[PDB]
Amino acid sequence: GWGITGNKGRCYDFWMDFSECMSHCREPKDCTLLREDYLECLHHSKEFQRRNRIYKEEQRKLRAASRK
Template identity: 50%
Template sequence: MASGIGFKGTNRCFPFWEDYQQCYFSSNDKTHSDCSPAREDYLECLHHFKEIARVRAIQAVERQNYAKSKANGTDHKIISLTGEKGA
């Protein structure tokens, strides 16, 4: 990562990068395993892997609830987190 300052100001993940970089260079461990939490935070900020997995898990439960309610004859609507209608 470069300076972290772009055309529109500071990158939103730059503070996480600074934390990881500080941990990495101050670590006495050659594998830098003590910096894993800081690295995970930085990668989550960049790619949202955990957030996406959580949204998919919530959507799967919603679909199951919808299928069960349809079988029981009750009314259960699916909540869309992406702005789409229905499922």
């Protein structure tokens, strides 16, 4: 849970939230929201897929307006 320039890493906070959950929650689910939070920090998969959908719909509209 370190960082490339010290400073608590990027989401050692999200991992602490996902570990405190997995500490005192008896199931792997009901602690999965925090797991998806932490993996979102790691790979930015949700953020990148949303940005790409934004840009994709924009590009489709622009191409439909350009070529028609």
